Amino acid sequence: VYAWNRKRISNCVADYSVLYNSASFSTFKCYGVSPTKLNDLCFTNVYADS
Amino acid sequence: FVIRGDEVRQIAPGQTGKIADYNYKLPDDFTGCVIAWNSNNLGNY
């Protein structure tokens, strides 16, 4: 946890639908945007901490 | 109707969820009292 990686993703066009269609995910949470309305918005410097 | 465990996480007014969003959602203006209790004793597919 103290040594997380920051992967910056840009210039990408991916289906932001399977990101919640994955049944392996125990529980999916969103705090800033509506989960269904993920495709419409335009992003900037997406981060991929894990 | 019955669900396998992860129920309250999906059954709620204005609550998403694959089973909830594909089978039956509640109205945003809803007035009811849902109850839940295990029926595993009642292996059985």
Q: Show the 3-state SS of chain A.
A: CCCCCCCCECCCCCCCCHHHHCCCCCCCCCCCCCCHHHCCCCCCCECCCC
- A16, A37 in Cβ contact below 8 A? no
Q: What does the alpha-carbon distance between residue B9 and residue B3 come to, in Å, rounded to a whole number?
A: 11
To probe the interface with A, which of B8, B15, B18 has the most A CB atoms within 10 Å?
B18
Sign of CA dihedral B6, A39, A14, A6: negative
Interface of A with B (CB under 8 A): 20-21, 23, 27, 35-36
Resolution of this entry, Å: 4.2
CA distance A15 to A39: 8
Measured between CA atoms, how close is B33 to chain A, in angstroms? 24
Q: Which two tokens stand for residue B28?
A: 């945003």
Nearest to A35 by CA among B21, B30, B8, B29: B21
* Experimental technique for the deposited model: cryo-EM
**How far is it, in rounded angstroms, from Cα A42 to Cα B10?**
28
**What single-letter DSSP state applies at residue B29?**
S
